[PDB]
Design a binder for this molecule. Structure first.
Ligand SMILES: CCCCCCCCCCCCCCCCCC(=O)OC[C@H](COP(=O)([O-])OCC[N+](C)(C)C)OC(=O)CCCCCCCCCCCCCCCCC
Ligand SMILES: CCCCCCCCCCCCCCCCCC(=O)OC[C@H](COP(=O)([O-])OCC[N+](C)(C)C)OC(=O)CCCCCCCCCCCCCCCCC
Ligand SMILES: CCCCCCCCCCCCCCCCCC(=O)OC[C@H](COP(=O)(O)OCCN)OC(=O)CCCCCCCCCCCCCCCCC
Ligand SMILES: CCCCCCCCCCCCCCCCCC(=O)OC[C@H](COP(=O)(O)OCCN)OC(=O)CCCCCCCCCCCCCCCCC
Ligand SMILES: C/C=C(\C)[C@H](O)[C@H](C)/C=C(C)/C=C\C/C(C)=C/Cc1[nH]c(OC)c(OC)c(=O)c1C
Ligand code: SF4
Lengths: 98, 318, 156, 80, 51, 68, 115, 171, 105
């Protein structure tokens, strides 16, 4: 349990490192966000099953709900980005500095 | 002895697949005013073995544009899931007694999609990708209705365990309470498995054998037998859920026999349906299965939530 | 008993498999394909013999050149024959494909599919009766039945 | 509007069934008398131990034994 | 304040709508070829696809 | 004719009947004249672990009675 | 471990089968048979290019409806509670809300495809 | 089978690491799927079936849409696998090695308290109720319909309003 | 909270499943129920700065129940000494820990 919680926190940190350190595409960033969601889910679920706190077990479903809504609007923004520029790259989004 | 049990569950299912191929060809023949295979065996009871052997002697195709990893791994996954789906099936006593069998089935099938969807991408070509995207659309169409149908049906059973449906159906079938859910479940099992009229991924006249155009040998054979195994699985599910056979604790082989009868009937019905109708369009499928099936599905879910209460028919938790 | 006899019977088995299940291609160019359809039709049913079509050339064991082969359609034929995975066989069907046919002396016709694909069996007619194409298919079966491959491998 | 529903039962009868069944699901719980026995049956199920109680000496209505007259007679669940 | 780096910087538009090289319409192309069983015999039928 | 389909259907049916009767009889053979126990909740698992530790042999399916 | 065993057995069946399919037959490889099909002729471009999807809004709302399934699915356990009125009202509200969203999308032509 | 959970956690770490290296969204979605599978398996190992099954289902249905999108938008001629970049391959190997060295390090500076290689599998479940019924995960989630009905309404509003948000962003 | 609208109206939208000893769906105790109850009943009326040092024993017992670090240390020490002794040949494990006991019921 402490082992797997350490590992899950390191996994969160890896996915956070990922979504911070960008590459060309944006879809990969959204996937890193989904991975952070998933690690947080598993942490919450394991704490709830360990402590036998069945009152908090409605929390991870809420996490999944709101994370999926987040993914939805991100993907809609991606649709708009492609309709504008055509190729998903995050380097073409460099005209607000001026 | 568990391994002998694995044998008695796995090898007869494969012979059943192999002879379902024969039955398909012959039934479609006689509906088409012809006799199917009657040459290679007495009445053609060796054509499946011939097809398998010939497919495993052909040279496999490793193209140049392909992604070989996903290419080889997708049929593996396909058959593995098709063959793990038979695991919790109570016929009547299952091999693996799970408490959430239907969720296992649902997740396993939603993962079975990825065989098509990665083989199509890995096989770098056009019709391949068309088949993949059509699979995406198909799953988008059917998954919601499958889940909410199954929820509404088990909302009078009381659990996700498959074995409790046998006691839920000790004196009746769930077809008379839920024939509409049964209709929609049947047609969603028809949209699942990529079976006509909802084929739309190996649609030989629209696409030139989508998601298999670059597969030749035993890989293609694996996809084939995965499809023809999922057919029997879904018929087994329909007849465990709605067409509940007789348990009779002293006579369990009676349950197994009536299960066999009903599963054969429903599989022959799949073949019948292939022979009778033309193909849908993969946007018309969306329009159908969102604008006709999902309204009625949600309405009947409301109904089946109300019904345990205003009838005092709340089932038991074990 | 003997390794050579065992090899002979094994080869008989593999030939039986490839012979009782040879999957042609939906590749028909001209009138002769109509008689191919008629062979697929009830009277002379092909699936009776384990001969059902497949649209992709990679899920196919044989191609039947049922029509006239032109200079514009020959690269496609050869691409398709190439893409077919070995073991593979060819049936030239009709005078227009055996030889040049009724269009032998024209500017846009290849005077036989012999020049582009290697043919195993020739079926004559304009058109060949589906009865006759069926005879030729069973003759190709008989040809596969006497392949003697593993025999010669043992004798290498 | 009767004519409108007459038209909709021919064209688009799937949504008519849907709205009908929705309203029926909402209205029928209000109607039945059996609607109230559901909570009572869910309550009757003893998933957890009925923990005994100390005899203060002022517990008349509480029974001294399982099969005494007092307590909730579950015979309404029988012959419902 | 004109830096070396902000020298090429141009002032934005007044309606917040920049003029762009509108991306080329790179439709996908497909040979609905002769071997295709729906091609009634021999029919190349190059066709462009936006999906 | 249509009765020439019944052979394949018969093989198919004999093959679909075996996975059930086979599982039932294997269960009865290993566990011993008894259906294989379902343990859906921890209470049933407790009962089975108990019956294991009662036996004298680590097998939950000996069913010691009123000889004790 | 029974289930792990069944799945490993199926896995190894599939892999042994692929091994046989690859190392049993004969091979005659060359570039003209290993290149993509495209019906006799050659492709005019790559297949790793944009395929415009015209049902993306339908995909996203499928995701949200999947979450709705995830919320509806605890009902078999929610029914053995003592209340049986709060759950009724709340499930009614959830399903009705989902139907309202479906109706708005339908009327606004979100279920139609982007021609 | 005592190192089961540690192996599952390490596999999940590797899945999320290969995710964070960001190949094309195809292999990223493959990583999400494998990692959700592993997550389900450990949630079961800790005594939870429903939550794992639902992670699996949700993430599968999501990566389906990700495939449908990335074929349209996040596609290139050469999708850049993990092996495509020597640098990415090097950082992946280095990340595995670095986490292994880190585990072997923190198993030294603290005998136990963060990680226990010695006693592994001995601390997982923490006071199970050896006699019980109506105790699984699913009762706690079904409390969304009773005793936690604000989570249900707030989630439902998120979904409902998300539909409108989708339509408006896309219009 | 910031705007105590719940306390204003007496409702509990979220302030009744704030911790472990709080109304599990059927009356199944979460682990450390007693410890958390005792910590909370000490830290009532008091706020913060005074509870953090007048209710420290009870929080420390709770922290040991939930995270459970000192028992790990204790068992790890016992195991390490046992392995050392068994390697030296000093300890001889009994039947009721090698896998051969008389089961009690
Ligand atoms: C129950 C039905 C399911 C069955 C599925 C599994 C299929 C089982 C197949 C059993 C038959 C095994 C024989 C397959 C031989 C195929 C290869 C072949 O014939 O080529 C000749 C091969 C190769 O012979 P070769 O060396 O002379 O090849 C010559 C090469 N060229 C063409 C370039 C000149 O012969 C063999 O290798 C035979 C021994 C292989 C036996 C392995 C088992
Ligand atoms: C994957 C899940 C995430 C786990 C972390 C990544 C660890 C595996 C990465 C290995 C590098 C693969 C790569 O670079 O791409 C090559 C390939 C692409 O192949 P290719 O297109 O370059 O073709 C190669 C051609 N030959 C064979 C001739 C060299 O892509 C993959 O390997 C990804 C497939 C999944 C890898 C996981 C395999 C698990 C084994 C189960 C069987
Ligand atoms: C080329 C590679 C292809 C790989 C394909 C992999 C196919 C995986 C098949 C899909 C599996 C998805 C579903 C997850 C497994 C089922 C979960 C489940 O509910 O049953 C698990 C079972 C206990 O679960 P439960 O029935 O709820 O509790 C019973 C209490 N008496 O018992 C368990 O808890 C253990 C379950 C272990 C599952 C093993 C998964 C194998 C993965 C190997 C790869
Ligand atoms: C802080 C230290 C920064 C060191 C920079 C190292 C260079 C690097 O790879 O990070 C940038 C990288 C973005 O990748 P990219 O812009 O495409 O660079 C060209 C690669 N072909 O960023 C990424 O791709 C994300 C990498 C995340 C690292 C995960 C592995 C951690 C373990 C090592
Ligand atoms: C279960 C069995 C199946 C699905 C088989 O695929 C079917 C029964 C067999 C067929 C279709 C046979 C031959 C293939 C072919 C591509 C012919 C060329 C052709 N095709 C035409 O129309 C379709 C024509 O129209 C006037 C033609 O002139 C020409 C020249
Ligand atoms: S040989 Fe005769 S029937 Fe055949 S394609 Fe030529 S003209 Fe037509």
């Amino acid at each position: 349990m402490p082992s797997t919680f350490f590992n899950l926190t390191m996994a969160f940190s890896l996915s956070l490192l990922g979504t911070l350190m960008f590459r060309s595409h944006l879809m990969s960033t959204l996937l890193c966000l989904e991975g952070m969601v998933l690690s947080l889910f598993i942490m919450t679920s394991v704490t709830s099953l360990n402590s036998n706190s069945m009152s908090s077990m409605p929390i991870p479903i809420t996490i999944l709900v709101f994370a999926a809504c987040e993914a939805a609007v991100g993907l809609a923004l991606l649709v708009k980005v492609s309709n504008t520029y055509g190729t998903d790259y995050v380097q073409n989004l460099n005209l607000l500095q001026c | 002895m568990f391994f002998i049990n694995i044998l008695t569950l796995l090898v007869p299912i494969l012979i059943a697949m192999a002879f379902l191929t024969l039955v398909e060809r012959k039934i479609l023949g006689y509906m088409q005013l012809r006799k199917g295979p009657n040459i290679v065996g007495p009445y053609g009871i060796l054509q499946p073995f011939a097809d398998a052997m010939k497919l495993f002697m052909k040279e496999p195709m490793r193209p140049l544009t392909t992604s070989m990893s996903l290419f080889i791994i997708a049929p593996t996954l396909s058959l593995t899931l098709a063959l793990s789906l038979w695991v919790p099936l109570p016929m009547p006593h299952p091999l693996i007694n799970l408490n959430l069998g239907i969720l296992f089935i649902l997740a396993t099938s939603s993962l079975s999609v990825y065989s098509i969807l990665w083989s199509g991408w890995a096989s770098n070509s056009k019709y391949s990708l068309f088949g993949a995207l059509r699979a995406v659309a198909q799953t988008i169409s059917y998954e919601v209705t499958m889940a909410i149908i199954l929820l509404s049906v088990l909302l009078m059973n009381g659990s996700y365990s498959l074995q409790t449906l046998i006691t839920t159906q000790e004196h009746m079938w769930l077809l008379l309470p839920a024939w509409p859910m049964a209709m929609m479940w049947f047609i969603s099992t028809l949209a699942e498995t990529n079976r006509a009229p909802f084929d739309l991924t190996e649609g030989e006249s629209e696409l030139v054998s989508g998601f298999n155009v670059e597969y030749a040998a035993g890989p293609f054979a694996l996809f084939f037998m995965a499809e023809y195994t999922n057919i029997i699985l879904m018929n087994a599910l329909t007849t465990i859920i709605f067409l509940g056979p007789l348990y009779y604790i002293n006579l369990p082989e009676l349950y197994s026999t009536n299960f066999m009868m009903e599963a054969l009937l429903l599989s022959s019905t799949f073949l019948w349906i292939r022979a009778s109708y033309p193909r849908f369009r993969y946007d018309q499928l969306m329009h159908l299965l969102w604008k006709n099936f999902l309204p009625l599905t949600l309405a009947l879910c409301m109904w089946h939530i109300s019904l345990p209460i205003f009838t005092a028919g709340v089932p038991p938790y074990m | 008993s003997r390794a050579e006899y065992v090899v002979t019977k094994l080869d008989d088995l593999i030939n039986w498999a490839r012979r009782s299940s040879l999957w042609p291609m939906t590749f028909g160019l001209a009138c002769c394909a109509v008689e191919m359809m008629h062979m697929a039709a009830p009277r002379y049913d092909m699936d009776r013999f384990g001969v059902v079509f497949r649209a992709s050339p990679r899920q196919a064991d044989v191609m039947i050149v049922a029509g006239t082969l032109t200079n514009k359609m020959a690269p496609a034929l050869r691409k398709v024959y190439d893409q077919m995975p070995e073991p593979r066989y060819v049936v030239s069907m009709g005078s227009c494909a055996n030889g040049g046919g009724y269009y032998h002396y024209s500017y846009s016709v290849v005077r036989g599919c012999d020049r582009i694909v290697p043919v195993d069996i020739y079926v004559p007619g304009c058109p060949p009766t589906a009865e006759a194409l069926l005879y030729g298919i069973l003759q190709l079966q008989r040809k596969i039945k006497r392949e003697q491959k593993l025999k010669i491998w043992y004798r290498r | 509007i009767s004519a409108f529903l007459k038209n909709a039962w021919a064209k688009e009868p799937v949504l008519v069934v849907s709205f009908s069944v929705w309203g029926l699901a909402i209205i029928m719980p209000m109607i039945s008398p059996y609607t109230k026995y559901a909570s009572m049956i869910n309550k009757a199920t003893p998933y957890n131990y009925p923990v005994p109680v100390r005899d203060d000496g002022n517990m008349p209505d509480v029974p001294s034994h399982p099969q005494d007259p007092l307590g909730p007679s579950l015979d309404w669940l029988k012959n419902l | 304040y004109p830096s070396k780096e902000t020298a090429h910087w141009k002032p934005p538009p007044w309606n917040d709508v920049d003029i762009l090289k509108e991306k080329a319409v790179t439709n996908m192309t497909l040979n609905f070829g002769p071997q295709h069983p729906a091609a009634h015999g021999v029919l190349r039928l190059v066709l462009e696809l936006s999906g | 004719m249509w009765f020439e389909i019944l052979p394949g259907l018969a093989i198919m049916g004999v093959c679909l009947v075996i996975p059930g009767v086979s599982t039932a009889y294997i269960h009865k053979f290993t566990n011993g004249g008894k259906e294989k126990r379902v343990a859906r909740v921890q209470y049933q698992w407790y009962l089975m672990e108990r019956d294991r530790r009662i036996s004298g042999v680590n097998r939950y399916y000996v069913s010691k009675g009123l000889e004790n | 471990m029974n289930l792990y065993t069944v799945i490993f057995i199926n896995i190894l069946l599939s892999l042994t089968l692929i091994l046989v399919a690859f190392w049993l037959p004969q091979m005659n490889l060359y570039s003209e048979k290993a290149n993509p099909y495209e019906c006799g002729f050659d492709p005019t471009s790559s297949a790793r290019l944009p395929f415009s999807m015209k049902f993306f809004l339908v995909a996203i709302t499928f995701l949200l409806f999947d979450l709705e399934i995830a919320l509806l699915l605890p009902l078999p356990w929610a029914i053995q509670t003592i209340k049986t009125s709060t759950m009724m009202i709340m499930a009614f509200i959830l399903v009705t809300i989902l139907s309202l969203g479906l109706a708005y999308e339908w009327t606004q032509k979100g279920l139609e495809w982007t021609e | 089978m005592n190192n089961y959970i540690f192996v599952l956690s390490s596999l999940f770490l590797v899945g999320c690491l290969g995710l964070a290296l960001k190949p094309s969204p195809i292999y990223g979605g493959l990583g999400l799927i494998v990692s959700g599978f592993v997550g389900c398996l450990m949630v079961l190992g800790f005594g939870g079936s429903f939550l794992g099954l639902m992670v699996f289902l949700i993430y599968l249905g999501g990566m389906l849409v990700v495939f449908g999108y990335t074929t349209a938008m996040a596609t290139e001629e050469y999708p850049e696998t993990w092996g495509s970049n020597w640098l990415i391959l090097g950082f992946l190997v280095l990340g595995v090695i670095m986490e292994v060295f880190l585990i072997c390090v923190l198993n030294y500076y603290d005998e136990v308290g963060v990680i226990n290689l010695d006693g592994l599998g001995d601390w997982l479940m923490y006071e199970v109720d050896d006699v019980g019924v109506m105790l699984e995960g699913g009762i706690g989630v079904a409390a969304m319909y009773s005793c936690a009905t604000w989570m249900m309404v707030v989630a439902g509003w998120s979904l409902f309003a998300g539909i409108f948000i989708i339509i408006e962003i896309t219009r | 909270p910031f705007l105590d609208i719940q306390k204003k109206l007496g409702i509990s939208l979220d302030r009744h499943f704030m911790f472990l000893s709080a109304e599990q769906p059927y009356k199944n105790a979460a682990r450390c129920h007693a410890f958390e109850k005792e910590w909370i009943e000490c830290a009532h009326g008091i706020g913060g700065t005074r509870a953090k040092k007048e209710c420290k024993i009870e929080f420390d017992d709770f922290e040991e129940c939930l995270l459970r670090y000192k028992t790990m240390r204790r068992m790890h020490d016992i195991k390490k000494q046992r392995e050392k002794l068994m390697k030296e040949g000093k300890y001889t494990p009994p039947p009721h820990h090698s896998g051969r006991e008389e089961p009690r019921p």
